[PDB]
Amino acid sequence: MNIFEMLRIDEGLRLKIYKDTEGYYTIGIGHLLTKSPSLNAAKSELDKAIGRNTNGVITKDEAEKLFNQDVDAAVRGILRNAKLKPVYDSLDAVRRAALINMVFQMGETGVAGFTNSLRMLQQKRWDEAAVNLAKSRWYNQTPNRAKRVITTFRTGTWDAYKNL
Ligand SMILES: [Cl-]
Numbered sequence: 001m002n003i004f005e006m007l008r009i010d011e012g013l014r015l016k017i018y019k020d021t022e023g024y025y026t027i028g029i030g031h032l033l034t035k036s037p038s039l040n041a042a043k044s045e046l047d048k049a050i051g052r053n054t055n056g057v058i059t060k061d062e063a064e065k066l067f068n069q070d071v072d073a074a075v076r077g078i079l080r081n082a083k084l085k086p087v088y089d090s091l092d093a094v095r096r097a098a099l100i101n102m103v104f105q106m107g108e109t110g111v112a113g114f115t116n117s118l119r120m121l122q123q124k125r126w127d128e129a130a131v132n133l134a135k136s137r138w139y140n141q142t143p144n145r146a147k148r149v150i151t152t153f154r155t156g157t158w159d160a161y162k163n164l
């Protein structure tokens with residue numbers, strides 16, 4: 001298991017524009033296009049992202065290309081954030097992947113706001129962090145995924161993604 005495999009499990013792979021859990025147009029491996037309610041708008045972001053006139057459908061290679069960029073951007077976002085970085089730096093590799101996962105899903109700014117959980121994580125108070133993490137809109141709206149990620153932070157193992 002690794003961050004790419006992990007996120008591939010959590011985000012799926014769809015080659016045509018579709019609506020994510022929040023109703024926003026997305027494509028590929030969780031690549032958010034826009035929060036706009038306009039499909040045309042989404043198409044336009046897609047073409048720009050890929051560099052060609054696609055009309056809503058891309059290839060697997062194209063999907064993976066955005067995914068690579070998106071994973072890199074999540075990492076870069078963590079490293080650039082004064083709240084996130086210290087946390088990430090304090091973590092082991094498996095847990096680092098859990099944080100990358102959350103940032104990919106919610107964005108840098110979003111995760112940066114989980115002040116208390118962040119603190120518990122830095123303190124290495126695993127069980128407490130986990131309880132804290134679950135007290136969130138995130139957990140409530142995507143509970144199975146959230147549970148996976150929380151288990152990962154709890155345990156520092158890939159048990160939640162094992163056998164999937
Ligand atoms: Cl992009």
Ligand SMILES: [Cl-]
Nearest residue numbers: 142143144145
């Ligand atoms: Cl879920």
Ligand SMILES: [K+]
Nearest residue numbers: 011012020030
């Ligand atoms: K998805």
